[PDB]
């Protein structure tokens, strides 16, 4: 009703509902509008609407898209968070001509920054993955921004519970595959599977039989296959072992992962050798997951 | 050539059920889909809300699915029907290898260039 | 309006089965008609040769509950329903049986015909 | 006082069933009467076309136990009771069956009629 | 007019059962409510004293099929439906159970209350 | 003496049942008599019409031999006008075919004297 | 009044059984009390030692919730010092697992007042 | 010495049963004879009143296996044996049934009489 | 009077069985004692070697019903009775079992002894 | 062409069994024919004496309809072949009451002196 | 050659049982013969008086007997033992063809130049 | 005197089975020994290869009832008996089992050996 | 000699199945192998994908002893053969408790390019 008058609509950004760029007429500014058709899934959907909209009203981080309002029209609903044109991150990185341990530490830092914020806000993302990681602009020094969805949740303090089975098979923690209560930690485990791809450009776990992929993910079976991992600082490999910890209670918190700087200090102290092969594999994986996923 | 497409979308459907991928399952199903199945206790259930329960709770034990003697009836360029026998080799609580048969009928309808199930009928053991 | 056409040819079908009229039943069925039914013992039978045995060899009241119809163009439809059957055994007592039925109709040369059907429950 | 009227139309109903009088039964039932019963195999049957078959088809004895009547205003009531039936099975041995019956009466055009009834057991 | 009005208090009943809130269930039931149910073992049990044991001692999904509402004036209604419940047994195996439910609602002082309940035939 | 009286009227009751004599059985039973028995399917029947069915159809037709045995009778006297007998009733009979069969039924008979005559106000049977 | 008295002592009996209180149950039962119940396997047990086993082992251990319902009580008064109650006993309980179960038992209690106090001289149970 | 003397009255007992002669059976049994048998349904029945029903209402072949005799002085004996009976059922089909029998004999006034009988577990 | 002696040696017998005292049981049984029992699977077992196995192998309650004693002279008797046993089955639910027992006592060397016993049921 | 030849002799076999013609059944079977069938109770039967009891008694006759489903033929040289299929029989028991029965059958054919003969056959669930 | 004699007398025995010829049966059996058989209910019976009942009462319906896999142990020139599987095709009350298996052991002893059964053991269905 | 020899070698056999001594069992059996037993599922097994599985892979009290012996010369015998077995299941309860056994012994080079044996009942 | 050759490849087959060696099992089987077995629930299975589930899961291992009874071989030319036999398996279930199972098996061998391969096999009661 109200989004009809104040706003003007322009090109689509993405689809799933449809994302589209708009600009507010009254105080001229761009945003990005989720157009959620009035056909969602009766109830299970409407519940996730208000959850996503609430969470995003709460999440205001410099590294996370912030919402503005959520308007309900007749045959549609609109959610207006912050706009971007940056391309995907795993897409920008391949375009880079110099990729080093120090660019990867610059990423996981901003990442852990969005994560920590919300973990302090009693909310867990549960779906952490390349898709969900984007670049503010293509402009230099553009920021990584976490994409708030939608299998998301509000925990009580540090209390662990069973929030049900959600997320992507590769990005799923064992505590969730074991069908045990969980919490903020299931987010840290994702980052760890993310960092590992953020170095060598292939994932730590995978199998075509998904029953098997899950077994690895429940068994913590990953290793640092030579040569590609030989040129990698043992600090890098250290963080990776701290996130990729099977027991969530022993798992490095997000607060802890920022202080230990194989990122901040290896930004200061780590390997910059441009690894062109990793970058290539990376790009390939990306295309595959786009078509396969 | 026209039947190979139905084979493709059907195998994708059975893969989504086997891997417990409910989102891909919802994409290949019409929102107003009807189903006769042994889990419905002789009742006709409408929508996907009834199958979600099986996707969440029931679905990492090794399971193998076999498709025997498919038959495809083409009814234009937008509607097709496929009927087949589905065998499932699995492991029970005791780890013993087991096998189950199931007769299945899938009614596909092409909407917006995308085949979707409008109705399906399963019989035999669940 | 079109749903009542499928319902009409379906009622004509059920009555053609109840009277034992294999002629009209053959006219309403495609020659390559496939069938799942308890009489086939989990197998898929093709043609009308399997159903002839019943018209030839075989006080009944049939009831249809909650018919749903899926139209897929102007030449394809699919109807699903519950079929209750009240009959008498040789013992003479009234018995009731339930069977869930699915019929797949296809218009060919301006006439609906069954291409495939799937029944569960009462054998 | 108005309980023996529900009992009266209920006794005329049961007697109409025992005599196989479809003519009176139709008068006592609304045309759009719904029914749950074992003969329906868990399905909800509407109308009287389903109950007709059971009128075309020796000594039996019926006993009604613990009748409870709920009065809802002056044009609607509901009676629930246990029905025991003693009969003979072909070989002639005496048998007995239990049923849990619920009748829902409504007064339209100055006449009580069953709008829906629910049965459990035999 | 009041069919949705009946569905409202029916849904509130379902919510009172799901949350285990026995007080709300007491507000929506007549003090002399009678109930036939499989847990009664064929006996006619009166009052909420029998259901109490379940509100003080109790992952599922419920589906309502073929709801029929009978409006009997401005103070009486009766709803009947089929309830299918999907649950996980002690084996952790998916199981499903069917019930046929009949609720008899009476209006007193501007509120709907259950005066009789009849379920069959699964607990 | 009173024990013998209660056994006498009890054996007269069982004798009226074995012969299908509904008149004598009616005279020995209170009009408001209640009953628990397997034929009642776990219900408490009141009166005599429920047993009348079995007197008219089953027990009136009996021309085959039937022999009843009362094992271990126990009598509780509760004043001058009340008594209670419990016993094991074993019935030797011939089935549909000519094969001898035996049935056991635990029986409790509650006797109350009104108008100078003992009458059953309640009985309870188990087994078939 | 007397009907209420018999229902009172009956509910006190069932209350003593539900709590496993063998002392109160002993006080409400005659020493020469006889019994028919499924636990006796068609036999007539006499005394209280047969029920003592269930008081000591089964009913003393119960910490789980148990709710008893007395359906359709019928009372026969037989003089000032005797009465007889019959009812349907429905028990809601929790089994070995945490699953609610229901049991039905037809019960006949024969009450006799001695020393100004009602006591059971005989009872009869059916069903399990 | 008396083992054959016990076998004699045992054989006379078998003959009294085979001929249906209830008088001879009465002469060979104590008036207060007790009996456990499957027809007693686990109850201890006293006297010949129970066996009477069988002597007034009754192609077979009987075999006695492993007879054991216990002589207990000059006035008491006890014989135990396995009895196998071959008969023709209502189907006209050959059937066989096993029983384990124990007879307790007492001497009074120069004659052996059954004071207790125990059979298991086929009629 | 001489019935409570049969009852006495019978109670010492049952108590010897419940305590698992093979030593006393052997004294109470003749060496050539014969037995019919369900554990024998319809066969006649002689001696005590067969009963030994059942002494090597918690709270149970035994009730003896309708004991009948036949006295045969002054050196032989026979007691028959019904034995009810309440126990607990692994899961701990109370159970009850019925048995029909017949003991045959004989006095040799001034001591009652079982020469043969017959059991039905459990 | 050869596959069809096997189909020919097989159809003649089924017709010979249905007609109760033991004469024609003998010609199409080797004198030392091997047999596994439920009528042999898990035993291996040699010869034609065993099936003669069924040719003489039962088949010598209410309406019966046979249906062959999913036939597969393996050709093993010029002189050897093997066919496997599902046999479904519709019949009537006592006062029909139409009934149906399934069996899984394997026939092993061998051409001896210019004539196909069964050397061994296997049946299940009949 | 020595085993063929045992085959002969054994086939004569089974022929006597099949034809219900009890006199020929008594000639081929020792008077003190012992037998374990399902009709004896796990008991050991001695003599021929126990089998006479089956010869008279039970034994004109067509019945066919098949002897599968005989094994003969020769123990001198006067004692032999044969063990075999016996199949029986018969007709029940409904006229339906039926079949029954039975494992049989026969212990032959040559007395006065004539083989006689001293003991036999049958198992399976009677 | 000779019967006790068969009984002796038979008791040595049963004890050789109870202890799991396949060596002495092999010495007491002919290499071409044939066997009928419930473990063979109605088939006839030859040699000792079938019985090795039990000595290798497999509180017991054995009792022998009514042994009968048939002597057929000075080099051949056959013993038949009832074998009762009192044991304990994994549940711990004492169980009893019956099996009728037939052993065929043949003296070869001055030593009795089993040529064939037939057991029925307990598997 | 040729009969013995069939026995050789058959024993190697049984040993390959027992050891859970799917590699050797693949060589001795035709890629389009036909199969009737109780694990297929009355259906005809083609290929080796179906038995792979049993090679991967179950057989990859407590003491098990196999016994072949009454083998019969039909030679049908130089390049074709068929063997039928009774397989008895002794094993242990959970906490044995030694168990035994019977099955009736038919193998159809065909020499292709100087190597015997199974083209079809049939199993009963397993």
Coordinates of C-alpha atoms in Angstrom, one line a residue, chain A residues 172-176 178 182-190 217 241-254 256:
Chain A
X172 CA 26.4 -28.5 8.2
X173 CA 28.1 -29.0 11.6
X174 CA 28.3 -32.4 13.2
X175 CA 26.3 -31.5 16.3
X176 CA 23.4 -30.8 13.9
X178 CA 24.2 -36.0 15.1
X182 CA 23.1 -26.7 19.1
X183 CA 23.6 -23.0 19.1
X184 CA 26.0 -20.3 18.0
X185 CA 28.8 -22.9 17.4
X186 CA 27.1 -24.3 14.3
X187 CA 28.0 -21.0 12.8
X188 CA 31.7 -21.2 13.7
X189 CA 32.0 -24.6 12.0
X190 CA 30.8 -23.1 8.7
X217 CA 31.3 -34.1 8.5
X241 CA 41.5 -26.8 13.5
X242 CA 40.0 -24.6 16.1
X243 CA 36.8 -24.0 14.1
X244 CA 36.6 -27.5 12.6
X245 CA 36.4 -28.9 16.2
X246 CA 33.8 -31.7 16.5
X247 CA 32.8 -30.8 20.0
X248 CA 30.9 -27.5 20.0
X249 CA 31.7 -26.8 23.6
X250 CA 35.4 -27.1 22.8
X251 CA 34.9 -25.1 19.5
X252 CA 36.6 -21.7 19.3
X253 CA 34.0 -19.0 19.8
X254 CA 33.7 -16.1 17.4
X256 CA 38.1 -16.0 20.3

